[PDB]
Amino acid sequence: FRIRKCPKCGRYTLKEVCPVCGEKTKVAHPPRFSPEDPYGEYRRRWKREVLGI
Amino acid sequence: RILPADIKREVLIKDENAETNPDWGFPPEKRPIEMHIQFGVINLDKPPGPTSHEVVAWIKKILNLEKAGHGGTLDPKVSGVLPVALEKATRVVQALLPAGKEYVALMHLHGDVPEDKIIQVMKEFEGEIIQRLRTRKVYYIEVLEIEGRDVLFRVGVEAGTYIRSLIHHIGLALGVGAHMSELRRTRSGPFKEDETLITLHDLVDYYYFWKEDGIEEYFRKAIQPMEKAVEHLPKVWIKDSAVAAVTHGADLAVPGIAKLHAGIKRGDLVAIMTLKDELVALGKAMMTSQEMLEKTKGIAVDVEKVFMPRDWYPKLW
Amino acid sequence: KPSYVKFEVPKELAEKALQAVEIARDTGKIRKGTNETTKAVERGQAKLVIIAEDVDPEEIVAHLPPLCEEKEIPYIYVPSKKELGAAAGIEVAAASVAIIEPGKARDLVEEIAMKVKELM
RNA sequence: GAGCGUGCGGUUU
RNA sequence: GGGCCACGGAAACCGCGCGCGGUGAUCAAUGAGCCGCGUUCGCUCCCGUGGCCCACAA
Ligand SMILES: [Zn+2]
Numbered sequence: 001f002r003i004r005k006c007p008k009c010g011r012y013t014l015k016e017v018c019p020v021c022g023e024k025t026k027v028a029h030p031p032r033f034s035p036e037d038p039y040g041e042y043r044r045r046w047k048r049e050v051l052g053i
Numbered sequence: 054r055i056l057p058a059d060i061k062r063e064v065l066i067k068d069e070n071a072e073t074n075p076d077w078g079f080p081p082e083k084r085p086i087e088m089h090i091q092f093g094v095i096n097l098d099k100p101p102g103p104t105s106h107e108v109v110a111w112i113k114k115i116l117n118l119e120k121a122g123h124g125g126t127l128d129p130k131v132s133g134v135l136p137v138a139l140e141k142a143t144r145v146v147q148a149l150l151p152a153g154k155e156y157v158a159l160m161h162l163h164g165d166v167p168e169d170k171i172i173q174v175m176k177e178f179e180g181e182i183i184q185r186l187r188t189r190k191v192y193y194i195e196v197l198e199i200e201g202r203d204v205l206f207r208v209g210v211e212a213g214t215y216i217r218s219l220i221h222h223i224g225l226a227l228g229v230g231a232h233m234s235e236l237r238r239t240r241s242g243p244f245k246e247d248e249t250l251i252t253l254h255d256l257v258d259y260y261y262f263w264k265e266d267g268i269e270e271y272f273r274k275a276i277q278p279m280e281k282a283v284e285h286l287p288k289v290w291i292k293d294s295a296v297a298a299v300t301h302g303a304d305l306a307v308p309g310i311a312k313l314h315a316g317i318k319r320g321d322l323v324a325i326m327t328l329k330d331e332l333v334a335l336g337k338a339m340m341t342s343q344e345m346l347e348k349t350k351g352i353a354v355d356v357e358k359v360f361m362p363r364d365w366y367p368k369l370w
Numbered sequence: 371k372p373s374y375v376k377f378e379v380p381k382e383l384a385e386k387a388l389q390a391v392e393i394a395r396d397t398g399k400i401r402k403g404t405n406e407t408t409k410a411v412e413r414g415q416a417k418l419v420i421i422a423e424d425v426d427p428e429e430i431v432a433h434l435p436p437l438c439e440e441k442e443i444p445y446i447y448v449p450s451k452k453e454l455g456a457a458a459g460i461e462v463a464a465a466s467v468a469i470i471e472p473g474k475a476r477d478l479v480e481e482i483a484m485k486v487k488e489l490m
Numbered sequence: 491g492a493g494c495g496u497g498c499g500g501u502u503u
Numbered sequence: 504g505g506g507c508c509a510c511g512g513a514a515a516c517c518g519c520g521c522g523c524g525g526u527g528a529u530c531a532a533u534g535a536g537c538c539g540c541g542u543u544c545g546c547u548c549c550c551g552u553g554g555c556c557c558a559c560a561a
Binding site: 001002003010011012013014015019028029030031032033035037040043044047048051 | 157254262
């Protein structure tokens with residue numbers, strides 16, 4: 001997967017730093033998902049910690 | 054970078070007095086989470102891999118739903134905006150499917166071409182194109198980046214336009230040939246990449262947060278009011294005394310209009326909103342915005358699809 | 371840096387960590403790749419989990435930490451996944467690693483495992 | 491049943 | 504009669520694609536190949552059955 005996007009500016013790019021903002025870019029395509037969601041249980045534990053008690 | 058969805062509409066006033074009674078109806082941010090869902094739409098960021106049909110199937114089984122229809126079918130390998138209309142709001146996809154779409158595409162050239170040619174030539178593809186046999190519109194094309202043989206670009210198109218094919222014809226116009234190695238849809242009608250564009254992961258999680266952990270916030274932000282699926286349509290706002298009539302299949306007569314968008318033409322698809330900005334129903338205009346404004350009687354909108362329940366507003370008539 | 375990275379690892383320790391793995395590849399047993407590594411933890415055969423700090427998307431390894439804390443298994447981070455794939459016996463980048471049996475990295479792991487109890 | 495949305499294709503009353 | 508709403512206009516095997524479990528590989532460990540198992544949304548016209556209203560907004 002090659003298309004990336006600035007998380008600050010929203011700009012699409014193939015580079016690793018925003019040609020516009022200068023921030024680190026990320027893959028544009030979302031994580032692949034499964035209905036079996038094997039690690040769903042633990043992903044939510046990580047995620048609840050992020051969002052707050 | 055302008056799709057028809059984007060055109061600016063001025064709001065004209067017909068009856069300054071009209072007020073809406075707060076006992077009646079449910080404005081989108083006043084709907085119990087349960088009803089918010091019944092009349093909700095998901096701005097989904099489809100992952101790569103699955104067919105769009107399978108995706109919505111995972112959603113119905115995980116959210117425990119009995120109906121849900123996505124708009125324009127994204128191909129398996131393609132990611133990005135896939136609007137999923139829920140339960141009682143399912144039929145709004147009919148405002149979507151026709152609406153313009155935008156994609157970001159990665160095209161791979163089979164041969165070397167100067168950065169100038171590529172741009173010049175891609176500019177020639179705006180306007181109309183034929184594919185299969187059908188003709189379809191390319192609204193704009195913007196090159197973002199060229200790294201040697203790889204060309205990254207945004208494109209805006211009429212509904213039903215085949216990007217893979219366009220990139221093919223570009224390759225042909227350039228000589229060296231081309232194929233599309235990656236595609237992502239960043240817009241479909243009113244649905245854009247913003248804080249409302251949720252991945253499957255965030256979604257099925259936020260659901261469990263509400264259902265199992267009793268937190269609403271996050272899951273409520275994941276569902277949008279059906280009214281969102283209508284932002285791009287011309288609207289006419291109607292009086293309280295006219296709302297119940299319309300949900301019972303009454304065409305909308307002029308005297309029941311409060312405000313309307315400018316530049317509506319006979320034949321145009323319009324959305325019919327209450328003064329609380331709730332979606333009542335979709336319809337076909339039988340008058341221009343000017344006729345409606347001046348006239349005192351007559352049918353202004355053939356009501357064709359009703360979404361609001363008949364018990365939200367009292368049968369005033 | 372990422373949100374699954376739940377604490378700070380010093381150049382010395384992180385380096386003492388890539389050496390750790392490098393050893394068990396031949397004197398003992400290890401497993402590479404998030405799947406093999408996750409499976410190891412759910413089995414309690416993982417004496418030490420090593421995760422990389424540059425995994426995009428995060429959903430690929432986000433689960434590992436909460437997983438390790440549940441099965442009481444020590445986990446540790448390393449600057450890059452390329453160099454982690456390298457020091458495991460492969461030529462492709464590896465997002466994470468387990469150490470099934472230390473072999474000759476025993477006192478090197480205990481070192482690691484006991485100084486990550488601090489940063490919790 | 492005829493269309494639409496880029497996605498489905500082949501068997502059997 | 505008309506408008507609107509609900510339901511119906513097929514089911515069962517099979518396949519590419521995708522994934523999960525197991526295995527875990529000489530540039531796919533963000534998962535090869537081998538095995539097993541999963542796995543496909545709706546809308547518009549029109550037609551039929553049923554329900555609710557017939558409402559120029561006072
Ligand atoms: Zn930017």
